[PDB]
């Protein structure tokens with residue numbers, strides 16, 4: 035393998051994202067002129083707040099991913115104060131940006147992007163990995179407008195944590211337990227948001243959102259594609275063992291065979307040209 039990279043190998047540019055424990059900065063490697071999104075984490079702050087297990091798990095999960103619809107981890111290094119993770123740069127930003135820009139997706143764009151997300155989840159879940167915080171903010175778009183799912187700090191590897199309120203599955207609120215089917219619940223919220231323009235469970239504060247989620251209190255706009263509504267109803271199901279895609283429903287085959295996806299070719303989505311948004 036190549037000798038470890040270091041900060042001096044790059045010219046750092048603009049900040050791409052900021053979290054409580056990390057900052058992602060666009061960087062151009064001098065020897066190659068390649069651009070990477072470098073996630074930078076301060077060792078002191080991680081240790082102080084007991085985040086070592088999360089940072090360790092994020093790195094370890096990313097190392098295992100080798101699929102076009104996921105962030106790729108190219109390299110890591112550290113200096114005295116900071117860890118550096120070299121990630122694929124998703125030039126077009128967040129799916130959420132496009133939702134806002136255009137309001138809501140037509141049926142062809144909903145179908146295509148939903149199919150990429152389902153195909154990515156099939157790969158992720160086949161590895162026994164659960165994302166636990168899936169949402170349009172961490173579904174990025176590459177230069178070619180294919181998805182690149184990111185943000186694995188909170189993932190779980192199948193042999194505690196609660197993600198973003200609007201996408202939280204009822205079982206987390208009633209058990210503190212997660213599973214693959216929790217990602218599928220989030221998928222149901224995302225589809226709904228692509229079609230309606232907004233997430234299904236909304237309210238003034240988290241407490242009230244949580245109330246709506248555990249009561250399955252949401253509804254569909256009249257202009258909701260009927261087949262997409264049927265799919266969303268089969269995903270937003272309080273009983274986690276009855277969600278389309280979960281093991282107790284015999285997995286991804288029946289999900290991928292849903293009528294909403296009739297015209298989808300599953301085998302080579304990454305090779306297909308995405309519908310203009």
Ligand SMILES: O=c1nc[nH]c2ccccc12
Pocket residue numbers: 050051058071105121122123124125174184185
């Ligand atoms: O461009 C990115 N690629 C991977 N992860 C990210 C996280 C935040 C902002 C950008 C990125």
